[PDB]
Amino acid sequence: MMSREADHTIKGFLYQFNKTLNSILSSTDQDEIQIEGIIEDIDIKNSNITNAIQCKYHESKVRHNLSDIYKPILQMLLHFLENDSLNIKYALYAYFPNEQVGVKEVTKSQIEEILSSSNFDYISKYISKIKPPKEQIIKELLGKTSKTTEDKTRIKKYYETSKLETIVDIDKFLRDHFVFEIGLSYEELMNETKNLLMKEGFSLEDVKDLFYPNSIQYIAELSILPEAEKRISSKNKLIDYLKGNKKTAMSRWTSEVLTRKQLLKVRKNQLVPSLNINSRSRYFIIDPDTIDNFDDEFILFVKDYLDKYNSKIKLHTETPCFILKTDVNNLSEYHKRFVSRNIQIITGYIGDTFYFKEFNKEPKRIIKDNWVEFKARISCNSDEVIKCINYKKCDDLYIVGGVDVSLLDTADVNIENLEINNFRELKYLLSMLKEI
Amino acid sequence: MMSREADHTIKGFLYQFNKTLNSILSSTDQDEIQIEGIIEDIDIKNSNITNAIQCKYHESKVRHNLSDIYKPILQMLLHFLENDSLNIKYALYAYFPNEQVGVKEVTKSQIEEILSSSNFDYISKYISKIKPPKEQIIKELLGKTSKTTEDKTRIKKYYETSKLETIVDIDKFLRDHFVFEIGLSYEELMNETKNLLMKEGFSLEDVKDLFYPNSIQYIAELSILPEAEKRISSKNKLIDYLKGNKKTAMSRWTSEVLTRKQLLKVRKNQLVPSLNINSRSRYFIIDPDTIDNFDDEFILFVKDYLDKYNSKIKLHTETPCFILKTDVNNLSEYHKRFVSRNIQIITGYIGDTFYFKEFNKEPKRIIKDNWVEFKARISCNSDEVIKCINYKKCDDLYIVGGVDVSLLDTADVNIENLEINNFRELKYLLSMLKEI
């Protein structure tokens, strides 16, 4: 049972995809778009917020039903009464299997009729805040985090026959806020989006894997900066970013849901370049937070990498390394483990110091001895750690979920991000594990 | 002893090198660069020409002297006066070891002192035209194409003691015209130019061999079209041609002269990569207009190229071909010579008509015979001949000097020019021959 907030975020991203497709199709000047801070109370202090993308979709069988709109409508209704009194007009952008395409109209009577859902969940979740009851016992029960069947029956009886007038102006939010529209079939719209994107030369899978995620990330980040003027986009900017470089694009986010057969893609085959070569120093950047297990796990992952991609000393001349922002001292737990399963490696930080020479110096290999001073080393992506881009430039850069990827030069780096759940998927991804 | 016109053309090439370097440095709206039709009396009938580059230098020992500017100044002086009085203001960019940098000032006295060179070469080549001699015998001797020492001494005496009065306005001929500027050491300036070109990512040698020729050829051909409006250049166009596509860019010629030991360099070894791989189908383009001993030389080039990179059946899987504009029918004249040494190579025209289906067939190499169905292919480029990029898109398109470049897709087809006078130089640069 996925959380309703996750569904809201997914629908918002889908509407972002629709807006991006509209931008691509128009190929001219487009209205101003700014992101909205509804996922959490960020309070960016920007009055220019109109999108308020919080759509949601439920099961549909035929035509339209009066009950197809659940609490989410009540969620946006409560969200209208913001603390700062800021324009947060929401919208709904979903289908009705067989229904006229248009707005639901702002008739007061229809919205009042819908408001009479008479459901305990809705009453106790969001409606209760909308209507401050005059029976303080109801408020006490709601704030007690403990309710019984008799309490639910009493509450529904009170709110059904003894309806109480809310404190918010009735005529304001019923007509001036909220809007409804018929959306697009995203499951079937993916093919149409791919077809429309395939208009220039491009390639077969590059657009499906590289260019479209780049465009989506650009659209998402267009309005994340503190400055409120960055939203300005004209025809010139759109045409410039449609075919400015569009060769590598320095991709930053990936992992769509096209072929996620218990495995990530795009950064699965493409890892072969820059890694089959024996003169590269690729680093890994990840975070234990996105991962489900890091106290004594990661070292054995290191195993399958410290005897296959540096073996055959006659060819290899560089050493792998692994970076992950764990903590200043938590990694000290591994500090006794690392020489346990017969691998010679170095933490590289050892305490509260960010050493520089060890992390970037090339070890000397001896062909005959079948051994080197260390096959690899582990590392940490702390705040003051920039040695992926400076020297021995981490010729296969990875990111998972979310990392402190700012304050970086980002120059001539084949940044190949891939958001995942745990390490096993990575071991599969670099073609080291047959399954999972 | 290179011709002075060749020196002027080379100096124009260096001046446009400097212009291209400045343009790359700025990346913004700049001056309107228009080429100059002064190499021959082409008579473009265009007046919006200001560059008019006719520089030339001599040996340099220390600082500068009055004798550091020879005849070229006189050629400039005569070229100010044409039959139509076209705006032909030339410019000089002479370099000196270390001296005051600036203009030579337009004072009449300095130019008049420079005029009194009193040298037979100057008197009999161009100066005589400036001053119509009042002695008709002098004109008869000059036009007789036969002169003796006594005649030269008499002319010098007449022009020295009996100095003639020219028919051109001296005040307007030495003051309102002529501009001088101190140049820089170009031999050491080319290294700085190459260093400055490698400002963006680019690559170690792509900028040296691919992007620099692209920019230079584009600058040269910007204003070669008959229309005078094409010279308009803006910041948007400059940035678009600076990073819009800039991957192959459909070049047409490479660097003229550098540190060559009787053979052009730099592009000699970079060409070996992308060739040893058994799936590389680089093409070539040649012209008998510039090449001299190309009547049946190419013949064994085929053979010689066809045992180096079309042998070793166990590995090689693709074959080269040579698309070269020789003639609609002279190709069949070549075709006699083609099949004599048991090398069956497709004509391309298959007579006189280039075809599309049977110029791109993939050969089937056979291990048990150490030979292939057809050991190579070729074709000849007329107006309607476009096949380099369509199938097996000639990753490394090759040209010499420069050939028709119209109606080209210019997609993932790296361009390289190998200026040559025969097939020995090309075979050297392609890493098949040993010397020359």
Q: Read off the amino acid at residue B409.
A: D
- Put simply, the answer to whether A244 touches B247 (Cβ < 8 Å) is no
- Which one of A234, A241, A247, A413 would you mutate to disrupt binding with B, by most B Cβ within 10 Å of its Cβ? A247
Count of beta carbons in the 10 Å neighbourhood of residue B352 = 14
- Put simply, the answer to whether B244 touches A247 (Cβ < 8 Å) is no
Q: Could you give the angle at the alpha carbon of B37 between the alpha carbons of B32 and B38, nearest 5°? A: 120
The tokens for B9 are: 């053309």
Residue A64 Cα to chain centre, angstroms: 32
- Residues B27 and B285: their CA atoms lie apart, in Å, by 33
If you count them, how many residues does chain B have? 436
Of chain B, the end-to-end C-alpha distance in Å amounts to 22
Q: Which residues lie across from A321 on neighbouring strands?
A: A283, A377
List the resolution, Å: 3.4
The tokens for B417 are: 């020019």
The tokens for A245 are: 């470089």
Residues 6+ apart with CB under 8 A from B279: B317, B318
Residues 6+ apart with CB under 8 A from A13: none
Residue B254 Cα to chain centre, angstroms: 8
CB B108 within 8 A of CB B171: yes
Residues of B in contact with A247 (CB under 8 A): 247
- Residues A328 and A348: their CA atoms lie apart, in Å, by 12
Residues 6+ apart with CB under 8 A from A279: A317, A318
Residues 6+ apart with CB under 8 A from B434: B428
CB B348 within 8 A of CB B321: yes
Count of beta carbons in the 10 Å neighbourhood of residue B46 = 18
- Residues A384 and A411: their CA atoms lie apart, in Å, by 18
- Residues B13 and A289: their CA atoms lie apart, in Å, by 60
How do B371-372 and B365-366 pair as beta strands?
Answer: antiparallel
CB B346 within 8 A of CB B400: no
Residues of B in contact with A250 (CB under 8 A): none
- Residues A300 and B58: their CA atoms lie apart, in Å, by 72
- Residues A189 and A186: their CA atoms lie apart, in Å, by 4
How do A377-378 and B283-284 pair as beta strands?
Answer: unpaired
The tokens for B77 are: 């002086």
CB A181 within 8 A of CB A103: yes
CB B412 within 8 A of CB B249: no
To which residue do tokens 């001993």 refer? B293
Count of beta carbons in the 10 Å neighbourhood of residue A373 = 11
Q: How many Å lie between the alpha carbon of B279 and the closest alpha carbon of chain A?
A: 17
- Which one of B245, B393, B409, B410 would you mutate to disrupt binding with A, by most A Cβ within 10 Å of its Cβ? B245
Q: Could you give the angle at the alpha carbon of B390 between the alpha carbons of B389 and B393, nearest 5°? A: 45
Residues of A in contact with B411 (CB under 8 A): 201
**Contacts from A357-363 at CB under 8 Å and sequence distance 24+?**
A359/A321, A359/A387, A360/A387, A360/A390, A360/A391, A360/A392, A362/A317, A362/A318, A362/A319, A362/A392, A363/A319
By what technique were these coordinates determined?
Answer: cryo-EM
Phi and psi of B417, rounded to 5°? -105, 140
Q: What is the 3-state secondary structure (H, E, C) of chain A?
A: CCCHHHHHHHHHHHHHHHHHHHHHHHCCCCCCCCCCCCCCCCCCCCCCCCCCECCCCCCCCCCCCHHHCCHHHHHHHHHHCCCCCCCCCCEEECCCCCCCCCCCCCCHHHHHHHHCCCCHHHHHHHHHHHCCCCCHHHHHHHHCCCCCHHHHHHHHHHHHHCCCCCCCCHHHHCCCCCCEECCCCHHHHHHHHHHHHCCCCCCCHHHHHHHHHHHHHHHHHCCCCCCCHHHCCCHHHHHHHHHCCCCCCCCCCCCCCCCCCCCCCCCCCCCCCCCCCCCCCCEEEECCCCCCCCCCCHHHHHHHHHCCCCCCCCCCCCCCEEEECCCCCHHHHHHCCCCCCCCCCCCCCCCCCCCCHHHHCCCCCECCCCECCCCCEECCCCCCCCCCCCCCCCCCECCCCCCCCCCCCCCCCCECCCCCCCHHHHHHHCCCCCCC
Q: Which of B356, B355, B337 is nearest to B345 (CA)?
A: B337
Q: What is the 3-state secondary structure (H, E, C) of chain B?
A: CCCHHHHHHHHHHHHHHHHHHHHHHHCCCCCCCCCCCCCCCCCCCCCCCCCCECCCCCCCCCCCCHHHCCCHHHHHHHHCCCCCCCCCCCEECCECCCCCCCCCCCCHHHHHHHHCCCCHHHHHHHHHHHCCCCCHHHHHHHHCCCCCHHHHHHHHHHHHHCCCCCCCCHHHHHCCCCCECCECCHHHHHHHHHHHHCCCCCCCCHHHHHHHHHHHHHHHHHCCCCCCHHHCCCHHHHHHHHHCCCCCCCCCCCCCCCCCCCCCCCCCCCCCCCCCCCCCCCEECCCCCCCCCCCCHHHHHHHHHCCCCCCCCCCCCCCCEEECCCCCCHHHHHHHHHCCCCCCEECCCCCCCCCCHHHCCCCCEECCCCEECCCEEEECCCCCCCCCCCCCCCCEEEECCCCCCCCCCCCCCEEEECCCCCHHHHHHHCCCCCCC
- Residues B253 and B267: their CA atoms lie apart, in Å, by 12
For the CA atoms of chain A, what is the radius of gyration? 27
The tokens for B197 are: 């070109």
Indicate the burial class of B48 (C-beta count within 10 angstroms; 0-12, 13-18, 19 or more).
Answer: exposed
Asked if B273 reaches chain A (Cβ–Cβ under 8 Å), the answer is: no
Cα–Cα distance list, B180 to B53, B92, B169, B186 (Å): 11, 5, 21, 17
Q: How many Å lie between the alpha carbon of A251 and the closest alpha carbon of chain B?
A: 16
Residue of B nearest to A243 (CA): B244
To which residue do tokens 């550098």 refer? B258
Indicate the burial class of B270 (C-beta count within 10 angstroms; 0-12, 13-18, 19 or more).
Answer: middle
Residue A305 Cα to chain centre, angstroms: 29
- Residues A190 and A204: their CA atoms lie apart, in Å, by 15
For the CA atoms of chain B, what is the radius of gyration? 27
Residues 6+ apart with CB under 8 A from B383: B404, B406, B407
Count of beta carbons in the 10 Å neighbourhood of residue A366 = 10
The tokens for A314 are: 């006659």
Residue of B nearest to A241 (CA): B244
- Which one of B240, B242, B413 would you mutate to disrupt binding with A, by most A Cβ within 10 Å of its Cβ? B240
